[PDB]
Amino acid sequence: RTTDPVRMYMREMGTVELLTREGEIDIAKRIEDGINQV
Amino acid sequence: ARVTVQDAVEKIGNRFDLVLVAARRARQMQVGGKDPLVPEENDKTTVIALREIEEGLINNQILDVRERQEQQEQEAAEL
Amino acid sequence: ETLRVDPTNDRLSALVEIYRMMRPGEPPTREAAESLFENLFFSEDRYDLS
Amino acid sequence: EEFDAIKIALASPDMIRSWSFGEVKKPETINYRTFKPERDGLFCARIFGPVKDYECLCGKYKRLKHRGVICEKCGVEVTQTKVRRERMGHIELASPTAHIWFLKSLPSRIGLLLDMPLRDIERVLYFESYVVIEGGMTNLERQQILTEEQYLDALEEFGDEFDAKMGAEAIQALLKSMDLEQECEQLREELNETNSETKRKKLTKRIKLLEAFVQSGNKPEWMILTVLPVLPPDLRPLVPLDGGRFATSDLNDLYRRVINRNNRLKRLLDLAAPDIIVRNEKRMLQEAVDALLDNGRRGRAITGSNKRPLKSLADMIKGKQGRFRQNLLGKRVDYSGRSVITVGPYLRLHQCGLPKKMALELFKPFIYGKLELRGLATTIKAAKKMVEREEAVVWDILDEVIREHPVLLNRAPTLHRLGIQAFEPVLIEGKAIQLHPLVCAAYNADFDGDQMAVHVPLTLEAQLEARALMMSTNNILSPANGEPIIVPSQDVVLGLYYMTRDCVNAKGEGMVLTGPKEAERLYRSGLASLHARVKVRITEYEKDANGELVAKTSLKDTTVGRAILWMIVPKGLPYSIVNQALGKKAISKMLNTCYRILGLKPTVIFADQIMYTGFAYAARSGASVGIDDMVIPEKKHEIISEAEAEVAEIQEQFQSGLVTAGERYNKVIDIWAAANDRVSKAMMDNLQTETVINRDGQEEKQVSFNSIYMMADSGARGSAAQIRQLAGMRGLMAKPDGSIIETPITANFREGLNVLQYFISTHGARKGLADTALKTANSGYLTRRLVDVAQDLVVTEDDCGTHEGIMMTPVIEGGDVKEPLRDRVLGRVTAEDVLKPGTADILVPRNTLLHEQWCDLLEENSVDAVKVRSVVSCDTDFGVCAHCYGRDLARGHIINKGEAIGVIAAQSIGEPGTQLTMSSIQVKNKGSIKLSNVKSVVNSSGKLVITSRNTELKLIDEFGRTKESYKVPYGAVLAKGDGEQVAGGETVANWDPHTMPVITEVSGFVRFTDMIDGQTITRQTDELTGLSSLVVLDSAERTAGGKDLRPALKIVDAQGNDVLIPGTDMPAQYFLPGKAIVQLEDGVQISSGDTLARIPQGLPRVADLFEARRPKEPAILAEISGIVSFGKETKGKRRLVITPVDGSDPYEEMIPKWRQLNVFEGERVERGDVISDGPEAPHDILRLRGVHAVTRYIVNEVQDVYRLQGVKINDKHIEVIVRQMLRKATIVNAGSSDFLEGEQVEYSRVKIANRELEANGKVGATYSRDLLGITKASLATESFISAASFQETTRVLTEAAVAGKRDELRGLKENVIVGRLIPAGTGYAYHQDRMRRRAAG
Ligand SMILES: [Mg+2]
Ligand SMILES: [Zn+2]
Ligand SMILES: [Zn+2]
């Protein structure tokens, strides 16, 4: 019966992880490309 | 009289009404400035008010009659 | 009596549920409960008798 | 200003828009240096108000050239100020968060309504799970949760045709959806389908909430917050100090907190975030909201660097701390003072010592008006100057004021109305207040470091109320009892005792007088003894005639002191009262006679002189007390050595191994206590009457010369116990364990302790002192609750015209009289015409003032019971008649209307309780015997044995009014009968105090039937003799083959019949339980009255008594008359096949038959008949019995708890609260309103006094009658403010607001805190004038 939203939010963000080194720059590419097409 | 409140009550019957009538009569005389009917004997207004009550001279009814009559004569004097 | 009443077949599950009751939620990993227990009563840092 | 009534309601959002003056927009408040209210911050004058008169901030607009000209630059007003305590700003919210009091508290009020679990809603509103707003398709359902991942399933399946979200948006919508009426008629309907209990109450509950929102017009969505108020600064201020140092309130933080979060809400909401962060943010927001309403409710509280929580809004209302108990009902006061205190021995009643500066500064504007009047000080600056100049005139002027100007005396703790008083001033050249010492007895006060405070009656009304009401001449007795409270305390008593005293010894014996004047001359010449019986004449007076004195005169041989003393006495009395040594009880009753006979003022002035002369002739009397006045007998060492060589006897006995410790323990303490008693007796005989002084004879002995006994005999101080401690052993001692020590004390303080003796003396001393340090808390607590109950109650009427009430009978029981019915009656008033043992000699026409002539007139009569119009039998709506009360005691006449009452019993009862926590029957003398409600029998002895447990014994006198009364067990053995006479001192009864007889009134054969060894029973034949019978085991030990089979050895004849109960066809055989073991076998026969078998063996109390506290262990009773058999076989509890004569059998209830039964498996009871054994509960009594029985039980109980301690209060007081516990009765039938619901029995009686009148033969309903615990009885109130003041406040307030309720200020508490006058007493007349105005429009 943990009401502390510390536990909630840290759980809810521990959900996700990180990726690196080209998915990063792939996202950059995607961003800038859609931007160039706007 | 001063220290004891006995026959003033035996006249009326209830302490509450006695201090009501007293504190009316002696505001007519504290601030207004009308006349006594019992002698003075060098006491504050309280004792003499209680004295006027004892011998059957001041009452709620009697104050009512006196102020009624006087105010009615003043209403007549207006016109 | 208590043993039968005790459902942790293994030490490992015991670690899990210790961690769980103490840290209610579901993040489990091992070193968490391991170091936890070890720091309770077996580290100089957080415990001393006089 | 004047307003009629109050009201609560639900503030709409636009209601707040209406209330507010501007919206707030930033967390800032001021500059660092220009300590200035900032715009749009906290203290923005533009919205809340200005500091100074007509000064915009930049000074643009000024001095009324520009009057109503808001300075456009700073946007600041010009006009007048003093609204930084009035104006509330506001804030508009982004999104809705919820209120909490309508959420978190018990029954939830919000989801309570929705028929939904809380935790579900938490999962919604901690933003964890979605949930059906509305199933667009009924594929799914409203009030149905979807996890945010299963929601995906529901979603990608359909996407479109469902409504399901997570937040107040999801929920206000729901409220905004749901229609009330249909739901209401539906629950009304399908209740009648299935109106089982929990179901029915739940349906009723929801229908109530429904129709409440209907008819209120209050609304469900208003739970939730979209605009929020903001308070004026001056309730939440910030100030500096002389050091330049600043100081704030908690709340300015919390307001500030939210701002930034809402800013970071909206700031983010410009910026298109993932929902997760939004959820987090909203959590922060509504968390802050909770923190405002309650820091520490939902969870771990919130602090600054204090490390301590921040004070809630709620905390301002709370505990004592809020307005109620700190700042509103108790108050600081101007024109009051205090000082250390002392005595005026010389003084009279109305007088009081007064250090003069006190009155000086306290009577200043009198003097300033007076100096302007004289014009010495023409105006007031010079008046104060001249004050500093210390002119004699001032003091004359000061005296000239002070005459006849009464004043108020104040000590704390104030436990009853007499603990403060009203005197007349007297001035003195000291700084210690002198007073009339006796009234310490009233104040429980003493000149050992006490001090007191003082107040002024400025206004004439107060002046005269003082002079008339708590003038002491108007207050001499208790209202608790007819007790003179000005008992001459300690010294006057003793000097007088010494005076009225009859030696033979001194001189001047056998001469004669004219009168006490020459007695003075004669003794004072030095001829005589003031204590010596010698002849004189007296001339005493009596008002035998029409209140008219009747003179006479004759002689007496009396002591000289008494002759002298007659001179004081006012001429209406005999000599007989003054004819003795006058213990202080004699003084009590003596002054009693004085006002009994003459009245007040003689007794008053008499008493003053008695005080005076006591001082005089006691200071003459000569007195001291010393080492040799303390005296030891010689017959102590030998009793000591004797019992010392006997404790050693039993010591060596235990050494041999004979006796136990507990045997040894009890007997050793017995012999030591006996030795103590013998020592006490020796010293008493050796000090009381030891002195041998000759006087015209060989030797003569009289009142002692030890100096110690008559200290106790006077009643001044002390008693035999303390004196024993000084002289003999001072009883035994205990460690705080509660155990008892073995070796008692030998030395005394004349001889000197051991190390160990004092070491041990330590303990219980510390213990009982700790107890003395804490019983006051419970005392104040309880008495506070008592007043908390009965505030409503005042007399209203002369006569309620009501029908009879209580009966009075004396309480003598078990001994001699304990309450004379004389003493019960006096000042009450009859219920009824009342005749004499001379029959039909009525003397009341249903009601007279039962003064002591009537009581004497009775006490003549052998009458022993009478009825009285009861406060309960009074029927005045919202008050009482004075008749059902009768007399005010310390008045000493009939109670007049208007004085409130419940407070009176409270002071009566609470005050003393501080002091309060700390076989055979043998006839005594001869007398008539009175036993009834009886079945019994000529036993096999020929004497008498009960066969109906109801009965008990009394010794009635030869007349007919009782002497003694003692319980008598069922079937116990007697040596006597009823309606006989017996000699005194005669064991009439006997029984085995272990046995509960299984006696057979029948005469019939025994045969082993219905019972077989090791099925229902065991067979245990007595190894020693040989005779036995089939031996019944307990519930458990027998075997299960006949454990469901009731064992019963059966009474037969030579044929085999059932010997039926004598007089009724009912068979006679015994379904024998455990321990009902029979001794004689099959074929045997018993007698009438023959055991087949035997059956071998304070403060919190009263706190529970009044609390409506309730046991766990009932001596359970017969619900209904008629026969009974037993029931189901113990699935935790046996049940009980009841069977009325003409009623209906099926009632039967779980019984722990582990505990003993009264009636057996084939035995009949009447209703109102105990079935098990133990204590019992009050609610059982009401639920079954009448009332008189009930109230009578409890009053007897608790009065005994008092009187135990030697405690004295009239019963009337205790009647009173009863009717205040009884303000609610649950309904039986229906047709007027809802079915069963508890409601004002008063208003029940109203509606039936309209409706079941020919309005209807009947539409409405009959009704039960109920009872409530006292605190919750207090809560259950029409008003809420008295309910709101003290306890469980928040909840009451919410429940009050939901229906938009209101109040009318009828209880005094209500009218106090607003500053109005009382609805009673003095303001009775005024407030009834106002009442008829409300009647007259
Ligand atoms: Mg004291
Ligand atoms: Zn300006
Ligand atoms: Zn009545």
UniProtKB/Swiss-Prot annotation, chain A:
Highest taxon listed in the record's lineage:
Bacteria
Q: Where would you find the membrane-spanning parts of this chain?
A: none
- Localization per Swiss-Prot or TrEMBL: Cytoplasm
State the family it belongs to.
Belongs to the sigma-70 factor family. RpoD/SigA subfamily.
Question: What does this protein do, in the record's words?
Answer: Sigma factors are initiation factors that promote the attachment of RNA polymerase to specific initiation sites and are then released. This sigma factor is the primary sigma factor during exponential growth. Preferentially transcribes genes associated with fast growth, such as ribosomal operons, other protein-synthesis related genes, rRNA- and tRNA-encoding genes and prfB.
- Subunit structure, per the record? Interacts transiently with the RNA polymerase catalytic core formed by RpoA, RpoB, RpoC and RpoZ (2 alpha, 1 beta, 1 beta' and 1 omega subunit) to form the RNA polymerase holoenzyme that can initiate transcription. Identified in a complex containing RpoD, the RNA polymerase subunits RpoA, RpoB and RpoZ, CRP and DNA. Interacts with Rsd; this prevents interaction with the RNA polymerase catalytic core and with promoter DNA, and as a consequence, promotes transcription from promoters that require alternative sigma factors.
Identification of the protein by name: RNA polymerase sigma factor RpoD
Query: Which organism does this record belong to?
Result: Escherichia coli (strain K12)
- Identify the segment of the full-length protein shown: 93 to 130 of 613
Swiss-Prot record, chain B:
The answer to keyword Nucleotidyltransferase applying to this record is yes
The enzyme's E.C. designation: 2.7.7.6
Q: Which UniProt keywords apply?
A: DNA-directed RNA polymerase, Nucleotidyltransferase, Transcription, Transferase
Descriptive protein name: DNA-directed RNA polymerase subunit omega
Keyword DNA repair tagged: no
The function of this protein is:
Promotes RNA polymerase assembly. Latches the N- and C-terminal regions of the beta' subunit thereby facilitating its interaction with the beta and alpha subunits.
Homology family = Belongs to the RNA polymerase subunit omega family.
Note the coiled coil stretches, chain numbering. none
A GO molecular-function descriptor: DNA binding
Q: Which domain of life is it from?
A: Bacteria
Q: Which GO terms describe its biological process?
A: DNA-templated transcription
Subunit architecture: The RNAP catalytic core consists of 2 alpha, 1 beta, 1 beta' and 1 omega subunit. When a sigma factor is associated with the core the holoenzyme is formed, which can initiate transcription.
In terms of Pfam families, this protein maps to:
RNA_pol_Rpb6
One Gene Ontology cellular component annotation held by this UniProt entry: DNA-directed RNA polymerase complex
**What catalytic activity does the UniProt entry give for this protein?**
RNA(n) + a ribonucleoside 5'-triphosphate = RNA(n+1) + diphosphate
* HAMAP family membership: RNApol_bact_RpoZ
UniProtKB/Swiss-Prot annotation, chain C:
Q: Which residues of the full protein are shown?
A: 349 to 398 of 1342
Instruction: Describe the protein's quaternary organization and the partners it interacts with.
Output: The RNAP catalytic core consists of 2 alpha, 1 beta, 1 beta' and 1 omega subunit. When a sigma factor is associated with the core the holoenzyme is formed, which can initiate transcription.
Free-text function comment from the UniProt entry: DNA-dependent RNA polymerase catalyzes the transcription of DNA into RNA using the four ribonucleoside triphosphates as substrates.
Superkingdom field: Bacteria
User: Which family is this protein grouped under?
Assistant: Belongs to the RNA polymerase beta chain family.
Can you name this protein? Answer: DNA-directed RNA polymerase subunit beta
Curated annotation (Swiss-Prot), chain D:
Record-listed Mg(2+) binding positions: 446, 448, 450
Which domain of life does this protein belong to? Bacteria
Q: What is its EC number?
A: 2.7.7.6
Key words of the record: Acetylation, DNA-directed RNA polymerase, Magnesium, Metal-binding, Nucleotidyltransferase, Transcription, Transferase, Zinc
From the UniProt record, which GO molecular function terms apply? Answer: DNA binding; DNA-directed RNA polymerase activity; magnesium ion binding; zinc ion binding
| One of the Pfam families matching this protein, by short name | RNA_pol_Rpb1_1
- Please name the Gene3D superfamilies in this protein's record: 1.10.132.30, 1.10.150.390, 1.10.1790.20, 1.10.40.90, 2.40.40.20, 2.40.50.100, RNA polymerase II, clamp domain (4.10.860.120), RNA polymerase Rpb1, domain 3 (1.10.274.100)
Database matches in InterPro entries = DNA-dir_RpoC_beta_prime, DNA-dir_RpoC_beta_prime_bact, RNA_pol_asu, RNA_pol_N, RNA_pol_Rpb1_1, RNA_pol_Rpb1_3, RNA_pol_Rpb1_3_sf, RNA_pol_Rpb1_4
Question: Quick one: which residues bind Zn(2+) 2?
Answer: 800, 874, 881, 884
> Which residues are modified to N6-acetyllysine?
943
* Catalyzed chemical reaction(s): RNA(n) + a ribonucleoside 5'-triphosphate = RNA(n+1) + diphosphate
Q: How is the cofactor bound?
A: Binds 1 Mg(2+) ion per subunit. Binds 2 Zn(2+) ions per subunit.
**Family matches, as SMART domains:** RPOLA_N (SM00663)
The cofactor required is: Mg(2+); Zn(2+)
Q: By its UniProt entry, which HAMAP family does this protein fall under?
A: RNApol_bact_RpoC
Main role? DNA-dependent RNA polymerase catalyzes the transcription of DNA into RNA using the four ribonucleoside triphosphates as substrates.
Question: What protein family is recorded?
Answer: Belongs to the RNA polymerase beta' chain family.
| Stated name of the protein | DNA-directed RNA polymerase subunit beta'
Q: List the top taxonomic levels of the source.
A: Bacteria, Pseudomonadati, Pseudomonadota, Gammaproteobacteria, Enterobacterales
Q: What is the primary gene name for this protein?
A: rpoC
